[PDB]
Amino acid sequence: LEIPTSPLIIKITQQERNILSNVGNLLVKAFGNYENPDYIASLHLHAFQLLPERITRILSQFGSDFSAEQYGAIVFQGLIEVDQDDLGPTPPNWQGADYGKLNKYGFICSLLHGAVPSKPVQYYAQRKGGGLLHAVIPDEKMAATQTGSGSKTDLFVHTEDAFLSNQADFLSFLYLRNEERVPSTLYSIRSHGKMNPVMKKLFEPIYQCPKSGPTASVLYGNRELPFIRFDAAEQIFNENAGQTSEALGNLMDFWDEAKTLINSDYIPNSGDLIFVNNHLCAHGRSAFIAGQRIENGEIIKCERRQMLRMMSKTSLIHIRSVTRTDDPYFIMEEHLGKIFDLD
Ligand SMILES: O=C(O)CCC(=O)C(=O)O
Ligand SMILES: [Fe+3]
């Protein structure tokens, strides 16, 4: 067994980059925007027909790969060319993002999800939906917070929406800007190798997954090669987590083993995309001061970090009891089965 300790790195070629750009432009002209119901309905057809063949092959292989050798993450280096001057300054927060300017990127990202094959979705739990594509920008008003809008503190490794029974299957993180040279942290359940006594206790549905309350298993799926639902900040380093002495102990014993396996080697460049199997690989990023980097004992001022996130589900059927009646891509789940009580 070759235990995976790092993600697969794919160096995108100039020809691939040029195909993606032309195909992105074409889809913008044809459908207006990536949330067009006609485009979403024929997504997989557009993905398999319009993407560079090597991208399609990589993502198809990845979608059904849950083997011992599979890390659960891919870095697509130089997927897109970002013209920094055209992009202009980073808005003060995600609310200031110009999705008219990010439209082509949303098309490109949705094609990658559609080749898994997987369908982009939105969550009421995340910005009351906020669309299929989210701009992740450091907000000065939320500098030391444990969110995507944060900066000043370490964003602990977590799988996305550990508190939801219908959390994303796949995630894409498109880096438009990372001039602060913030490392992206990744953690795979596969980095542990063979099933062990510490891991086995996590299959027990005795754990709190904060958004008494309902409990769930941290490990699920196959007993030998499991899937993971984990949030270190929310489940372990939270005074209000409400874990039992037994569960907290198990989580702590697990965190001790897991923290040595966290990979912080990759520093994304502008135009890089990280593609994640949200059932295998947790993500985070180190602390940073937005709009600056330190080099040879001097402060270098720069444009603020800007990343685009897209989430997807492989089945609209399984999630149908938690989606909107008139939108099967809009997840209304609040906490482990419970739906948001709105009206
Ligand atoms: O900034 C990052 O790379 C990760 C932020 C994050 O946790 C997210 O978009 O879910
Ligand atoms: Fe996240």
Author numbering: 19 to 229, 241 to 372
What is the paper's account of this structure, in its own sentences?
We have focused our work on the iron(II)/α-KetoAcid-dependent Oxygenases (αKAOs), a mechanistically diverse superfamily of enzymes that use dioxygen as the oxidant to catalyze several reactions via C-H bond activation, mostly hydroxylation. These enzymes operate with three substrates, dioxygen, α-ketoglutarate (α-KG) and a primary substrate.
In α-KG bound structure, α-KG is best defined for monomer A. The carboxylate moieties of the co-substrate form salt bridges with Arg338 and 334 (2.9 Å; 2.8 Å and 3.1 Å); the α-ketoacid moiety binds the iron as bidentate; the terminal carboxylate interacts by H-bond with Tyr193 (3.0 Å).
